[PDB]
Every structure is written in C-alpha cells, then in structure tokens.
Design a protein around this ligand. Structure first.
Ligand SMILES: *[C@@H]1O[C@H](CO)[C@@H](O[C@@H]2O[C@H](CO)[C@@H](O)[C@H](O)[C@H]2NC(C)=O)[C@H](O)[C@H]1NC(C)=O
Lengths: 48, 144, 48, 425
C-alpha cells in the first residue's frame, strides 16, 4: 500500500482478493482444514 | 369530594378536579384516562399516567377497569346518552327527598357500567374509592 | 405599600409554587436563565 | 414439533397459560433465571474477549447473526417448554402488514385475573433488571416512538415493508447479511427510544420480550428467503463466504453449564441452516396475503426497474445512532431523503462489513425532480440516542449509484477511419 503523511482519509468498500488455491493444494490442505493466515506489515521506513 | 382539593393545593395543585359530562355521547373513555405512559425528559424518565390504576397498601393488588357495551348506546338524536332522559326526570320534580331517591341510582349507574365484573374495581364500593374516575364522577354529581 | 389580604394572597401563591414539581414548576420555569442549558436548541452538540 | 402462530390470532386460554409459565420462570432465578437468560445475550455477558477485555457475547455484524439469534430463541422456547408447557412456542409478531399499534399481549401494564380478583404483573409489558454489581435494580421501559404507525395510501406500503422486500429479494447470502442487518436494526431503536435501559442499546436490550417478538419474525423471513432461493435454484445450504467464521464454534452454549441439552447437541454453526430439526414449524409461509409464486413474480419483475441507490460503508460506533440521509441539488433546492439506524454498545466487538450497503433513494431524487441518471449530491446527519446531533465526519461520505434496466447497453465507442492528423500513436 502506498501511503504518506499527507493522505486524505480513504477506505475501501469491498475486500480485495488474493489467490491461495495454488498453495493450499500444494500443501494438501483443504480450505476447511484448520490453518491460519499470518501477515506481517513493514513500512518503507523499516518499522514492523 | 371537596376535601381532596385542599390536599391537592397543599401538595402542589394547579386546577381543581375536572368534571366529566357523560350525558354527551361517549365514543370511549376520555383519552386522559385512556393514555398509559408519556415521556417528558425533564427527569429523563418516562412517566406512567396515574389515571389508570391504584395501589392498595393492604392487598398488594390493583384495580382493573372494564368497559361495557351498554355504556356506548346513544339516544334517538345521537347527541345524548340514554341516561339523559332519566337525568331530566330527576331534575324536573320538586321535593328534595323525592329528588334524592330519584337521584341516587342515577350516579350509581356508571359505577356498574365501568366497574365490570371484578371484585377489585368500581363495581364494589369497598374499593371504589381507589380509582380517580370515582372522584371525577362524584364531582359531576355535585354539579348536578 | 402592601396590606394583609393581598400580602397573604401573594405569599400563599408563591409557597404553593415552591413545593410544586410539575412541568410549570418553579424550578422548571427558573431553569430557563441558567443551567441546564437548553439553547439555541439541545439538538446542537454545543450547549450553553 | 411445536406449531407456531402470530400473536394477533391467538385466543385467551393459551395466553393465560403462556403468561403463567413466563411468570413462574421469571420469578425464580436459580440457574434457570430469565435475567440470566437475558445476560446470555447481553450485559453482563460471559464470553470474554480473546484478549481478556470482557466484551459481549452477542454476535452482530458477522455471518452468524441470524443463526446465533435463532439458536437463542429456540433455546428460550425450549426453556419455557421444559417447565411443563407443551402447546405453543414463542409467537411471532408481524409488522409487514401496515401496523397502527402494539399487539394486545404487550398492551396492559399489569395483567388482570381472568376470573376477577387480585391482579398480576404483566411481563410482556416490561421486565426488571436487578444486577447488584452494577447496582441497577430497576424496571425497564418502553419509550415508544409515535412514528412506527405510518398508515399510508394503498399501492405502496410501509418503508419497512419495501426495504425488507428488497432484502429478501437480493440473491446472495453474503450480501443478504448486510441487507438484513439494517432491517433488523430498525425496530430496536424505534422502540428503545430515549431511555438508556431499553431496546435501543445493546447492554440490556433483550430483557424486554419484544426482543423475542421481533427475532421470531426475523427467523420467519429468513426461512422464506431460504425457500425462495431454493425455488430459484442456487446453492444455500453451504456459504461460500466467511468459512472460517462458520468453522468457529458458537459460545457460550458449548459449555456444559447450559441446562438445555439441544444447544449442546447443535453448538455447531453449520447444522443451524436447517430449522426443522430444531423443533418448531411456522403455520403459514405467506407474506401479508402474498405467497411464494406471487412474491417470486413480483421480485423478478422488480429486478428490471431503473433505480437510484445510495451506497454506504460503516463500522462500529460503541453507541447506537441515527443517520438522516439528505439529497441536495448541486451548487439550494435540497429536500429530505431518508433514515438509517445503527446499533452500538459499550461492550461490543469492533465489526466491519465485507460489502457496501445499498439503500433506496430513487423516490427522493424523483421528488427533487432531476432525472434518475442525472446529477445530485448526498449528505448525512448523525444523531445520538438522546436526540442530539454529533460531528458528521465520523462516518465516511455516502456515494450514489445508478442501476439501469436489465438489457441496457452502453453507447458504442467511435471507430474512426484515419483519425485525421491530430492523433498521436
Ligand atoms: C447524549 O449522550 C452522549 C453520550 O456520549 C453525550 O456525549 C458526551 O457529551 C459529553 C458532554 O455532554 C462529552 O464530554 C463527551 O465527550 C460526549 N461523549 C462522546 C462519546 O462524544 C451527549 O452529550 C448527550 N447529549 C445529550 C443532549 O444528552
């Protein structure tokens, strides 16, 4: 996401999609199995 | 009936108890009694109208009103209740004792018309003084 | 320049108002000048 | 199962039976207390936050709202039945018909004895919250708003009716969630009103039995939507969205502390998509005289109608609020447009929607007189529970959308022959 200090507030309406099928099948886990999604956000400055 | 006005004034009255003229056609009970609860927000608390029920300090119950079909009957012209004719009859005669004997049952009537078939209502005089419509009606009686 | 009759009338009328607690009560009427604020109108988020 | 009726068609003896059972359930608490059952829904809730923040257990804004509340109502009806009553379940109050006043069961403040004698409390009029930790030992209230009885001219009907009609019209569960929560969130505010302890809030909203009188009809229209979608032929028994949320187990009915065993049997969210096994059947599946075929045809014909709509995005507030929506001409001739209600509470999970909300604005634009596909602007005003307004920049600005008639096509782009010489490639 491209953000700066002088950004007028903005918020989306509907979720954005990312494909996961090609990794879930490659691990063998069906979508209903117990699995987690972990995301780590790093700014350009370098702070998590 | 007069006795209650001194208590009301000393406790913060504004006008005396109004009289209800039931000789006029009666669509239903007056909306002042018919209303249940109103909100004013001055105390930020809804207030229930004390002109529907009455608490009893010995029985822990409350009175219950009941309309009766005959109360809604109307005269030939439609501008008077059926009780109008007998009210005129009471008015017309001369002697005071005859007036009283002809007059008692007249105001006794509404007690039974609105008291229904409940032991705790205006039907029995034992507890009829626990409903303010009784005060209003006897005020109209004094007016007669 | 008052006399007994009307002086009694005024004092009794005011003492009648004082212990009232109605919509046209002494407290309610005198509340217009000051706290609680009800003006310009309670709908506005600023009250004074 | 238990057959279910609407309140306006019941007779006296069953009313007396159900009121007797309700009184004998609400007087005693033990663990089978009506106050505890309400606290299951609201404050004081028991499902603490996963961060230990002591948050409510009430599901609002998520996928499992209708299922959780249907489980709640069936739990209470089974609770009542276990006390010895085996005739009728908790009846449903219909408001789709143009309403004028409250139903008879919730009218009298203190019930009369049918034979005549000592009176008895009317629970259906009101209940009482007697929490000692929060030192609130006071009865609830019904701060009714007068604007719930809009008897309008025929042809068109109450805005509640049209809006819930569009809600049941829409043809996807994930969108049905959003299009349903707004409809559910109307009566709560409009009955709770100014008083804090009422239906408008969320801490003690369910103490008044109007909660169940409402959620019964909620489940009814949910079932009619399921049957309509089944007839139109799309998959409904499984949801292609919020699968993780469905996999999540409901709380706190899972734990063994619940005396009712049916909740322990059906703690999973998946099984609730079928209502027959729960044990109650609605007598009629017609909406104010219109049955499956008529409503199907009406919805199909209405899905080819030009419309102007307002799109919204929303989240939690922490306190319920009205939003009056306003349509103006561009820069002034600006006229009233409509209303929206949102529910908030002190203890409630931060909820956000997965889809923008659609609202009808076509009639207001027509009143303004501009063409539906013309131009205009939309603004919003926010009011709190206590009537007063608030800084209207908290919510994101509304947007306008034009929905064309089905079969419409865009104007054809130009083809050109040599593009003259002004063009640059
Ligand atoms: C209605 O209730 C809200 C509850 O928040 C009140 O908002 C608070 O008002 C006080 C001053 O009156 C402020 O100090 C708080 O910051 C406000 N709270 C929030 C969350 O903004 C509001 O004042 C009440 N209005 C009326 C007319 O009673």
């Amino acid at each position: 996401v491209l953000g700066g200090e002088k950004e007028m507030p903005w918020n989306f309406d509907r979720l954005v999609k990312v494909e996961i099928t090609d990794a879930l099948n490659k691990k063998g886990l069906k979508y209903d199995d117990e699995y987690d999604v972990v995301l780590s956000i790093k700014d350009v400055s370098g702070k998590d | 009936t007069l006795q209650v006005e001194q208590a009301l004034l000393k406790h913060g009255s504004t006008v005396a108890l109004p009289y209800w003229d039931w000789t006029l056609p009666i669509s239903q009970l007056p909306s002042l009694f018919t209303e249940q609860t109103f909100y004013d927000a001055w105390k930020d608390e809804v207030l229930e109208n004390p002109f529907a029920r009455g608490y009893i300090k010995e029985s822990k119950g409350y009175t219950v009103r009941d309309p009766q079909p005959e109360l809604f009957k109307l005269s030939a012209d439609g501008k008077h209740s059926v009780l109008f004719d007998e009210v005129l009859l009471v008015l017309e005669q001369t002697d005071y004792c005859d007036f009283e004997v002809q007059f008692e049952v007249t105001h006794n009537a509404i007690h039974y018309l609105v008291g229904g078939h409940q032991s705790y209502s205006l039907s029995s005089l034992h507890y009829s003084s626990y409903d303010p419509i009784f005060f209003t009606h006897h005020t109209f009686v004094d007016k007669i | 320049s008052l006399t007994i009759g009307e002086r009694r009338s005024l004092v009794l009328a005011l003492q009648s108002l004082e212990e009232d607690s109605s919509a046209t009560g002494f407290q309610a009427l005198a509340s217009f000048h000051a706290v609680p604020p009800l003006c310009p109108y309670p709908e506005a988020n600023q009250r004074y | 199962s238990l057959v279910r009726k609407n309140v306006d068609l019941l007779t006296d003896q069953e009313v007396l039976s159900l009121e007797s059972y309700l009184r004998e359930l609400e007087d005693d608490k033990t663990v089978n207390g009506y106050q505890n059952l309400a606290a299951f829904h609201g404050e004081p809730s028991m499902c603490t936050k996963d961060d230990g923040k002591r948050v409510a257990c009430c599901v609002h804004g998520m996928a499992t709202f209708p299922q959780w509340h249907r489980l709640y109502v069936v739990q209470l009806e089974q609770k009542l039945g276990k006390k010895g009553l085996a005739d009728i379940g908790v009846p449903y109050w219909d408001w789709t018909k143009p309403i004028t006043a409250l139903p008879r069961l919730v009218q009298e403040p203190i019930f009369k004895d049918p034979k005549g004698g000592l009176g008895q409390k009317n629970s259906w009029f009101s209940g009482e919250i007697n929490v000692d930790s929060m030192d609130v030992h006071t009865s609830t209230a019904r701060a009714v708003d007068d604007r719930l009885f809009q008897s309008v001219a025929p042809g068109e009907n109450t805005q509640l009716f049209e809006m819930v009609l569009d809600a049941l019209e829409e043809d996807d569960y994930c969108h049905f969630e959003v299009q349903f929560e707004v409809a559910h969130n109307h009566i709560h505010y409009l009955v709770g009103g100014r008083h804090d302890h009422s239906l408008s809030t969320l801490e003690w909203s369910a103490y008044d039995p109007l909660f169940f009188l409402h959620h019964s009809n909620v489940d009814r229209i949910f079932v009619i939507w399921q049957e309509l979608q089944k007839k139109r032929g799309k998959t409904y028994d499984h949801a292609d969205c919020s699968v993780e949320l469905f996999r999540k187990k409901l709380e706190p009915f899972d734990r063994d502390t619940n005396p009712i065993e049916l909740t322990r049997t059906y703690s999973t969210a998946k099984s609730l998509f079928s209502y027959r096994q729960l044990g109650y059947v609605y007598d009629d599946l017609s909406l104010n005289g219109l049955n499956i075929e008529q409503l199907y045809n009406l919805l199909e014909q209405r899905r080819a109608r030009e419309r102007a709509l307002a799109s919204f995005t929303l989240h939690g507030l922490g306190f319920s609020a009205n939003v009056r929506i306003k349509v103006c001409d561009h820069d002034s001739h600006c006229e009233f447009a409509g209303d929206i209600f949102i529910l908030g509470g002190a203890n409630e999970m931060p909820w956000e929607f997965n889809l923008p909300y659609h609202f009808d604005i076509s009639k207001a634009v027509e009143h303004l007189g501009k063409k539906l596909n013309g131009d205009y602007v939309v603004t919003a005003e926010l009011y709190s529970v206590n009537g007063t307004s608030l800084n209207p920049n908290l919510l994101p600005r509304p947007v306008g959308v034009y929905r064309p008639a089905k079969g419409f096509t865009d104007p054809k782009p130009s083809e050109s022959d040599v593009q003259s010489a002004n063009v640059v490639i």
